[PDB]
Design an enzyme around this catalytic site. Structure first.
Site, PDB file in Angstrom:
ATOM      1  N   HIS A 137       0.975  -1.243  -0.105  1.00  0.00           N
ATOM      2  CA  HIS A 137       0.079   0.048   0.009  1.00  0.00           C
ATOM      3  C   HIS A 137       0.832   1.254  -0.026  1.00  0.00           C
ATOM      4  CE1 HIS A 137      -4.051   1.971   1.503  1.00  0.00           C
ATOM      5  NE2 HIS A 137      -3.426   2.760   0.755  1.00  0.00           N
ATOM      6  N   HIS A 139       2.075   5.091  -1.555  1.00  0.00           N
ATOM      7  CA  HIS A 139       1.868   6.225  -2.358  1.00  0.00           C
ATOM      8  C   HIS A 139       3.136   6.741  -2.767  1.00  0.00           C
ATOM      9  CE1 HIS A 139      -2.612   6.820  -1.438  1.00  0.00           C
ATOM     10  NE2 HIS A 139      -2.194   6.084  -0.576  1.00  0.00           N
ATOM     11  N   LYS A 220      -5.956  -0.317  -8.523  1.00  0.00           N
ATOM     12  CA  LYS A 220      -6.572   0.263  -7.393  1.00  0.00           C
ATOM     13  C   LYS A 220      -8.028   0.863  -7.462  1.00  0.00           C
ATOM     14  CE  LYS A 220      -6.640   1.861  -3.053  1.00  0.00           C
ATOM     15  NZ  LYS A 220      -5.664   2.836  -2.789  1.00  0.00           N
ATOM     16  N   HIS A 222     -10.600   3.201  -5.638  1.00  0.00           N
ATOM     17  CA  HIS A 222     -10.506   4.123  -4.536  1.00  0.00           C
ATOM     18  C   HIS A 222     -11.585   4.989  -4.570  1.00  0.00           C
ATOM     19  CE1 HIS A 222      -9.047   7.202  -1.625  1.00  0.00           C
ATOM     20  NE2 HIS A 222      -8.005   6.345  -1.557  1.00  0.00           N
ATOM     21  N   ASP A 224     -12.262   7.932  -3.981  1.00  0.00           N
ATOM     22  CA  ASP A 224     -11.999   9.297  -4.254  1.00  0.00           C
ATOM     23  C   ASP A 224     -12.285   9.270  -5.862  1.00  0.00           C
ATOM     24  OD1 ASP A 224     -11.473   9.737  -1.662  1.00  0.00           O
ATOM     25  OD2 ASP A 224      -9.613  10.778  -2.158  1.00  0.00           O
ATOM     26  N   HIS A 249     -10.208   0.614  -1.920  1.00  0.00           N
ATOM     27  CA  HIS A 249     -10.476   1.325  -0.552  1.00  0.00           C
ATOM     28  C   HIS A 249     -12.129   1.526  -1.113  1.00  0.00           C
ATOM     29  CE1 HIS A 249     -10.001   5.545   1.356  1.00  0.00           C
ATOM     30  NE2 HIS A 249     -11.418   5.362   0.961  1.00  0.00           N
ATOM     31  N   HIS A 275      -6.517  -1.307   4.311  1.00  0.00           N
ATOM     32  CA  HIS A 275      -6.887  -0.851   5.593  1.00  0.00           C
ATOM     33  C   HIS A 275      -8.317  -1.125   6.027  1.00  0.00           C
ATOM     34  CE1 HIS A 275      -8.610   1.970   2.904  1.00  0.00           C
ATOM     35  NE2 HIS A 275      -7.427   2.404   2.572  1.00  0.00           N
ATOM     36  N   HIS A 323      -9.205  16.380   5.058  1.00  0.00           N
ATOM     37  CA  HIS A 323     -10.428  16.642   4.419  1.00  0.00           C
ATOM     38  C   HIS A 323     -11.114  17.993   4.729  1.00  0.00           C
ATOM     39  CE1 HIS A 323     -11.092  11.833   3.825  1.00  0.00           C
ATOM     40  NE2 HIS A 323      -9.865  12.058   4.106  1.00  0.00           N
ATOM     41  N   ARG A 339     -16.250   7.298  10.936  1.00  0.00           N
ATOM     42  CA  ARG A 339     -15.123   6.652  10.583  1.00  0.00           C
ATOM     43  C   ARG A 339     -14.094   6.160  11.623  1.00  0.00           C
ATOM     44  NH1 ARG A 339     -11.663   8.576   5.193  1.00  0.00           N
ATOM     45  NH2 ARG A 339      -9.953   7.552   5.599  1.00  0.00           N
ATOM     46  N   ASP A 363       0.501   2.315   3.848  1.00  0.00           N
ATOM     47  CA  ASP A 363      -0.320   3.501   3.359  1.00  0.00           C
ATOM     48  C   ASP A 363       0.510   4.726   3.479  1.00  0.00           C
ATOM     49  OD1 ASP A 363      -2.462   4.975   2.575  1.00  0.00           O
ATOM     50  OD2 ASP A 363      -4.068   4.036   3.784  1.00  0.00           O
TER      51      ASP A 363
HETATM   52 NI    NI Z   1      -7.387   4.117   1.249  1.00  0.00          NI
HETATM   53 NI    NI Z   2      -3.887   4.736   0.550  1.00  0.00          NI
HETATM   54  O   LIG Z   3      -5.450   4.598   1.848  1.00  0.00           O
END
Ligand code: NI
Ligand code: NI
Ligand SMILES: [O-]
Ligand SMILES: *c1cc(O)ccc1O
Ligand SMILES: *c1cc(O)ccc1O
Ligand SMILES: *c1cc(O)ccc1O
Ligand SMILES: *c1cc(O)ccc1O
Ligand code: NI
Ligand code: NI
Ligand SMILES: [O-]
Lengths: 570, 122, 100, 570, 100, 100
Positions: A137, A139, A220, A222, A224, A249, A275, A323, A339, A363
């Site tokens: 995981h 980025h 992935k 996600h 978003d 995710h 996660h 956020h 959350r 992550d």
């Molecule tokens: Ni995620």
């Molecule tokens: Ni992530």
């Molecule tokens: O994540």
């Protein structure tokens, strides 16, 4: 002639029945067997055994069963066991685990583990040796993150990103053919193994599939980018055809569906749930229920690991700020409360201990720490020993069972999940020689030497201007394996079969070893080593309490951890 | 319960080295004027010419000491050492080039030793 | 200044030692890297003062005691090594078991 | 018009008969001759002489006798002399030493030293210029060691190592074809010249020889791999066939022989005896007797150089700790006492002064300092001037004789020994333009600018964000010569003739200049410049006292050295 | 903080100056890099205080005297140059023969 | 010491904080990077002391006030973030509007 056991261990590392403390935790591993022949142990130095005509053979050419490298007297900690052996490496791969030396004069020498003229030596007596960690995981946000990962014994990064663009800052995605090509080229300069995930989003197959053909090693999904039923379905269809893994995710907001909707879209196909506890994202509040299914390969990210007195405060605030969530907007407050949940975080500790969550991961730089996957795995194991006691299946007062269950979460299991365990993820004959040496005092905290493809890539070493390599300052540094063209032979770029068949590496001029992603679609939870439990997990939608087998899972946070203030300057 | 990070808790017992192999004790003397230190795994008949001992009793053998240690002979020193038998194929190559083959060729090793002046070829 | 590579790196040790001394002054038991930094910097500054390798070998054993550091730190530190420029050139100092 | 001599020297650097102090030592070098024409000196800047139509020729293309680079007004310090000249470089080689400028209007211009449109200028007035140092005892342990070496004016590293593996930490060995290939590839990213030694150990030829064919530039025999009669013999047999040098660290323990045994195994063949005094290893206690033989090329390593009041304490302890030698084991104490000897260390100072030890070297990171070969050579010269006085053969109150004897030990002599003096090791026409500029105040201590293949590779320069390059902080930094692909043209990888003939560089994709190792087997002590003395050296086995020509060699250690606390921040 | 490359490097000078001041306080004659560091850092801190280039050109000659440093140091240092951010931007200060 | 990459970098913040504190002590209004350094280092040292994330979230708002800094600095700094090792591991502290 007999040697007492304290002296033996001090000279050659521990042997059968000896135990060793993992850093400053309460965890003890016990040597299960020992491949040596007592009196013929290999060692190197003035007047020592690996010398021509003695423990080193002077007759054979390199092709004739001779090693490129021998790691002497290693205490191996792996899903396959905790045991003492020499490790032989050749052509950048582990070719022998057993007993190295010279069959001219030594009993018990593994036949392809001859020390010859061609052989380098690494003394591992007194060290614990593990496979390199496999972080699935990642980025790709900041290239300084690579050294951070190596310093804590991670040697493979799977993820996505183009640097600190918002897409990448939020998601493990390198989108489209062009960005994927660019990052494959960038990867030629990163001293670590890498695999790149494309964007698992689309309503037609072709936009997604062309990323796999371009070089992605997986996808992935996600929230978003829209973790909609359509994106899930098209991604899994692409993946079943291309033989790569999909990570998810899921839709935290439940906008197009609840958890059961996501599961229906998945429809029994294989998927890596990222996660899984959900702090890091996913259907509120019951995402963690994914971890009981046979087709889900479940991982945690690291900031929830383990549950501590500061965990919630840190997360609530991390979330609110990332956020742009305002403290006086009650939807934001409710969102944040749905959350970040002590009930599921506490329960996640227990799920790990019971072998229900199979994997750890970072992550890195997008709600997780690049250099703490390994660190926090062991902190979690130690916390569970303290609160739950030795597991039922322990023998001899050792923690070997738990040690195997936990080491699997960041070595072999992520490898299996990603379709790369034919190359990496454990210390077994035939696999790439990605190895980490640890002083037991620093175990899980700071790697002594990180070997990549049979050459040291990273090491805690001192002043380069000194007479010897130990004077201060001792710090993590890149070694010859990372320099010049040697960076190409010591690291693997993992890619899809189709990209490989279409000549992508030649097209781009990639000079790194090319690893094939395969056998990801025919596996399940039952294939995760020591972490293969399926069960009905219930998460109460009003109280968020977690049940498994009708038993409520509660646990306390701790105020202090091992592998922390004793070790770190900040 | 004081924690020493990374400490060992070794089991009970003791490790017998070279178990099951014949042992042999011989007297050995450094007739030279400089120190001679001999490692655990050097074929004993091939050590420094100036060590005087019954060279035949070094054939096919090495010091019965822990792997990686050495016996030290100061100049003029005479002492007893214990030998154990070589294992594996019981072949020796290189070192002083007295053997280059099976350690069973006792005659040939001793003839070479004596022509080159290794002391104590009897 | 004409700083060479070791000069640059060694500034870090001094800086870490200052950090660690400030922590000790406010009452903290020192950790592993803190302890190592303080002792190392003490050795380098001693060499700068013109002490001998032997003096620093002795003195280095009495810079921090076990009640200055956390549990296990003394046992983690088997020795500490540093090179510095003495009046007669660069030399290596090794302090064995600096904290008893 | 006449210029007084202080002003002349201040503007153009010193001329015939002027002297210059070497840093803060007591050593003075004297300009022996000067190639200039007074009134036509070259110099560059606003209103200065190297301008189009004046000292710069505007007519000729680069092929037509024009230089790529002119170093103006350099004070050259070399085995061939101490003298003043311009230095002309083209295609990365020194093509002219003499007088540069424009023959249109200037008298005395060396015909291939035209300053043209194609010519860059480096102002060397007021600098001492030497060849780059040639370090023949390097352990490749930590890549940060390269900058350390450049900062003290070293430009060629010969040695071995794969990073901080125990083999490499103890020995200058890159063992076998695979490790050698890996380090040749690594070398593509090291900004310095390199040659790699294989393992000089084996009882059959083939295991050893295949390292030479793989790319090694020589071999190392080290006691830690078995410095047995067989390994010595097979190594020298390989070397006589392959035309490469062998270095030896002999059997300190006298296990298979005494010194005379090692000499018999060598049997008159050429060999480079490493750290010949023996602190750094070798037959106890008389190894230093190697240095009187005609077939031995003898070098010291640097930590014994020169003998100081701290030398013994530092070494005794360095040794004890590196070899895990216990203070209460009397064999260890006796071992340490037989190896670290004030008698031979004191004598080594004198042997250097008398031209009996021919070479210096570092032993970088394995009992020696990567950045102090040059530094300690000059400290030793200065100590000997102080204790012994000017040498008999000095004239005019200068130390030129001693300066030439000493500079040879780290420039031309190691080159000759290694078979590479056709390329490097001195400032002579036809050789590679590896040049070091020194401010006389910093001489031997910190290099001002290091030129590699005609391009600056390293420099003491200031703040990159400033209006000019001098503001603080002034520190050693890598320059454009080390960047991108230019690292390939500015550095040489030295390799065996057979590897070169078998296409190794193409096989591996090496892009560096490839230098051939040759003419190592037909040389002796008599070929070492200014250091060619053979003699009977006796070392008393009871007292360790050293005699040469029946004269006992004793010397005192000193409490203080030049080139030390005045210069270094630590 | 948004540190740019020069900001990072220039922190080293400050750190070296602190080291060198601590050495002077314990009675040592300063060496070449020590001296250079102290003077450089004094210039940069002056600019931070809002002094003018002319003031620092003057003052910079009186920060250390010959009895603060080792033999030959004064003569090794012909001038010292630094850039810092004044209230009116980055400017260059050159101090000639700072130690007489 | 076994410094990892973040340990190395984080030494810089401490060093900048020391610089900035010395400037404040001589009467200067602090600038943007100075202010950020002081607050960051305060957070990291707090974690070293064993405070909680909540304590540092509160305290971090009262380390510097508007009269400690130049015009506009308070408004340039919307929050400050740091990670440090607490007794229970690495955690993230965010201080919102640290200077009011
Ligand atoms: Ni995620
Ligand atoms: Ni992530
Ligand atoms: O994540
Ligand atoms: C800033 C950047 C992110 O990527 C996440 C959270 C904050 O505050
Ligand atoms: C956590 C988990 C258990 O199983 C028991 C106790 C705590 O705190
Ligand atoms: C450590 C490492 C070496 O290579 C040598 C000596 C010590 O103490
Ligand atoms: C050393 C060598 C000499 O030749 C004379 C005096 C000392 O100390
Ligand atoms: Ni050696
Ligand atoms: Ni060496
Ligand atoms: O050596």
């Amino acid at each position: 002639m007999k040697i007492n056991r304290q002296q033996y261990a001090e000279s050659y590392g521990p042997t059968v029945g000896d135990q060793v403390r993992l850093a400053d935790t309460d965890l003890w591993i016990e040597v299960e067997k020992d491949y040596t022949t007592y009196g013929d142990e290999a060692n190197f130095g003035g007047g020592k055994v690996l010398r021509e005509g003695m423990g080193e053979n002077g007759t054979y050419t390199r092709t004739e069963n001779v090693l490129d490298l021998l790691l002497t007297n290693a205490l191996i900690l792996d899903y396959t066991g905790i045991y003492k052996a020499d490790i032989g490496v050749k052509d950048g791969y582990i070719v022998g685990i057993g007993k190295g030396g010279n069959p001219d004069i030594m009993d018990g020498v593994t036949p392809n583990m001859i020390v010859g003229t061609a052989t380098e030596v690494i003394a591992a007596e007194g060290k614990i040796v593990t496979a390199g960690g496999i972080d699935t995981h990642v980025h790709f946000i900041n290239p300084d993150q690579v050294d951070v990962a190596l310093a804590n014994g991670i040697t493979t990064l799977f993820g996505g990103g183009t640097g600190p663009a918002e897409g990448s800052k939020a998601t493990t995605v390198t989108p489209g053919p062009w960005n994927i090509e660019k990052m494959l080229k960038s990867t030629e300069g990163l001293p670590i193994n890498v695999g790149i995930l494309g964007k698992g989003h689309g309503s037609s197959i072709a936009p997604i599939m062309e990323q796999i053909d371009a070089g992605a090693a997986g996808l992935k999904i996600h929230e978003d980018w829209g973790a909609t039923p359509a994106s899930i379905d098209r991604s899994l269809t692409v993946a079943d055809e291309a033989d790569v893994q999909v990570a998810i995710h899921s839709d935290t907001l439940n906008e197009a569906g609840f958890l059961e909707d996501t599961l229906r879209a998945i429809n029994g196909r294989v998927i890596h749930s990222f996660h899984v506890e959900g702090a890091g994202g996913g259907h509120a509040p019951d995402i963690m229920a994914m971890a009981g299914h046979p087709n889900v390969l479940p991982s945690s990210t690291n900031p929830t690991r383990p549950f501590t007195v500061n965990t919630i405060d840190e997360h609530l605030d991390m979330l609110m700020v990332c956020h742009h969530l305002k403290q006086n907007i009650p939807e934001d407050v409710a969102f944040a409360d749905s959350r970040i949940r002590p009930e599921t975080i506490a329960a996640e500790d227990i799920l790990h201990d019971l072998g229900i969550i199979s994997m750890m991961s970072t992550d890195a730089l997008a709600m997780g720490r690049a250099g703490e996957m390994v660190l926090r795995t062991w902190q979690t194991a130690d916390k569970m020993k303290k609160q739950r006691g030795p597991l039922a299946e322990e023998k001899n007062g050792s923690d070997n069972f738990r040690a195997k269950r936990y080491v699997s979460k960041y070595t072999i299991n992520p490898a299996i999940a990603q379709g790369i365990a034919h190359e990496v993820g454990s210390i077994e004959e035939g696999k790439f020689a990605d190895l980490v040496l640890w002083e037991p005092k620093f175990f899980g905290v700071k790697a002594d030497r990180v070997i990549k493809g049979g050459i040291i890539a990273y090491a805690q070493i001192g002043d380069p201007s000194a007479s010897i390599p130990t004077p201060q300052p001792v710090m993590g540094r890149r070694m010859y394996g990372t320099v010049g063209d040697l960076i190409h032979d010591t690291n693997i770029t993992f890619m899809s079969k189709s990209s490989i068949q279409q000549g992508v590496p030649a097209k781009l001029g990639l000079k790194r070893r090319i690893g094939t992603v395969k056998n990801c679609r025919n596996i399940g939870k039952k294939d995760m080593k020591w972490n293969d439990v399926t069960t009905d997990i219930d998460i109460n939608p009003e109280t968020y309490e977690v049940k498994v087998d009708g038993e409520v899972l509660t646990c306390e946070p701790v105020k202090e951890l091992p592998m922390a203030q004793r070790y770190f300057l900040f | 319960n004081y924690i020493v990070p990374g400490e060992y808790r070794v089991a009970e017992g003791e490790i017998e080295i070279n178990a099951g192999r014949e042992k042999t004790t011989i007297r050995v003397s450094n007739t030279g004027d400089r120190p001679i230190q001999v490692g655990s795994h050097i074929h004993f008949v091939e050590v420094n010419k100036e060590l005087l001992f019954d060279r035949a009793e070094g054939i096919g053998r090495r010091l019965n000491i822990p792997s990686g240690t050495a016996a030290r002979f100061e100049p003029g020193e005479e002492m007893e050492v214990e030998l154990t038998e070589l294992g594996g194929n019981r072949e020796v190559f290189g070192i002083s080039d007295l053997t280059n083959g099976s350690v069973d060729n006792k005659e040939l090793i001793l003839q070479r030793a004596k022509e080159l002046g290794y002391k104590g070829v009897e | 200044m004409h700083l060479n590579p070791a000069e640059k790196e060694k500034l870090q040790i001094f800086l870490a030692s200052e950090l660690a001394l400030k922590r000790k002054a406010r009452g903290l038991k020192l950790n592993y890297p803190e302890a190592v930094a303080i002792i190392t910097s003490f050795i380098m500054e001693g060499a700068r003062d013109g002490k001998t390798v032997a003096m620093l070998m002795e003195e280095g054993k009495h810079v921090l005691t076990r009640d200055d550091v956390m549990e296990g730190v003394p046992e983690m530190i088997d020795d500490i090594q540093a090179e510095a420029t003495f009046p007669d050139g660069t030399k290596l100092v090794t302090v064995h078991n600096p904290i008893s």
